[PDB]
Amino acid sequence: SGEYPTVNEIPVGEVRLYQIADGVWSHIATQSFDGAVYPSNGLIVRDGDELLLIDTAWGAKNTAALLAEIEKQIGLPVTRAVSTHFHDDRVGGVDVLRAAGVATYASPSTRRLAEAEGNEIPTHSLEGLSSSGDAVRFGPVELFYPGAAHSTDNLVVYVPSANVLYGGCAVHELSSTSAGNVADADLAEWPTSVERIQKHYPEAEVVIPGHGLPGGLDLLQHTANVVKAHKNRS
Ligand SMILES: C[C@@H](c1cccc2c(-c3ccc(CS(C)(=O)=O)c(F)c3)c(C(=O)O)[nH]c12)N1C[C@]2(C[C@H](CN)C2)OC1=O
Ligand SMILES: [Zn+2]
Ligand SMILES: [Zn+2]
Numbered sequence: 471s472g473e474y475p476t477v478n479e480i481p482v483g484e485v486r487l488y489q490i491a492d493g494v495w496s497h498i499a500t501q502s503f504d505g506a507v508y509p510s511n512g513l514i515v516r517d518g519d520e521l522l523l524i525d526t527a528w529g530a531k532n533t534a535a536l537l538a539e540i541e542k543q544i545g546l547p548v549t550r551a552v553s554t555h556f557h558d559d560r561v562g563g564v565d566v567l568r569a570a571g572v573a574t575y576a577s578p579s580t581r582r583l584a585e586a587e588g589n590e591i592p593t594h595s596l597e598g599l600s601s602s603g604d605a606v607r608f609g610p611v612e613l614f615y616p617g618a619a620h621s622t623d624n625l626v627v628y629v630p631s632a633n634v635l636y637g638g639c640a641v642h643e644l645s646s647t648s649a650g651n652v653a654d655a656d657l658a659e660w661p662t663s664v665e666r667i668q669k670h671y672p673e674a675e676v677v678i679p680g681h682g683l684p685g686g687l688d689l690l691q692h693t694a695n696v697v698k699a700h701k702n703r704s
Pocket of ligand 3: 557559639681
């Protein structure tokens with residue numbers, strides 16, 4: 471009823487939307503992985519009379535439910551989607567999107583990693599993002615490659631009309647106590663990549679993590695802190 475929805479508030483297979491700003495929503499879904507349930511976020515951005523989707527809802531059935539929720543709550547067609555790295559919480563559901571008429575995009579790095587790991591593969595490659603600090607425009611957003619962090623391919627998304635920074639899984643929520651799933655991470659470079667985000671988007675008003683609650687710019691510094699401490703404990 472208005473609060474940001476949480477993991478215990480969304481059954482696996484349902485999707486919620488949350489209004490972030492004019493023409494900007496997050497999507498929230500839950501999924502089981504190795505015997506535990508986790509929430510995950512994505513983004514929806516109005517693109518005239520169409521919508522741009524950032525990230526799947528972590529699975530085929532979740533992503534079909536996402537499309538149905540968009541049709542119910544917004545009623546504009548999703549025409550393009552961008553996946554911000556190669557893990558299943560970002561690309562799982564790309565086949566559902568593609569069969570629904572959505573054009574799917576990711577960096578060449580993401581596409582190669584998804585293919586090699588057996589995850590679903592976005593159709594179109596996003597050039598111009600291969601060096602840290604690179605940025606390109608994509609409809610109503612800017613895509614930014616900050617460097618290796620949660621994964622070597624992770625991208626961040628900025629919505630300039632609303633000063634919304636979607637960090638994806640390179641950014642953690644304020645309540646986080648560790649750096650999440652670090653299987654494919656570069657803990658040594660992650661603080662430098664977060665610093666690049668901070669320097670590139672100093673006017674961000676809302677920061678959305680890949681999992682958990684949005685907040686303000688403090689999510690970036692908190693992420694650097696938890697990552698350094700993870701490496702320090704380990
Ligand atoms: C699909 C994704 C994945 C699965 C399950 C959990 C997570 C988390 C996560 C996020 C938050 C917290 C709370 S917290 C900050 O307080 O710790 C947490 F506990 C876990 C994340 C994320 O951190 O982005 N991603 C997760 N996968 C799988 C894998 C590829 C496989 C290797 N082949 C392993 O590396 C992934 O990332
Ligand atoms: Zn990941
Ligand atoms: Zn993640």
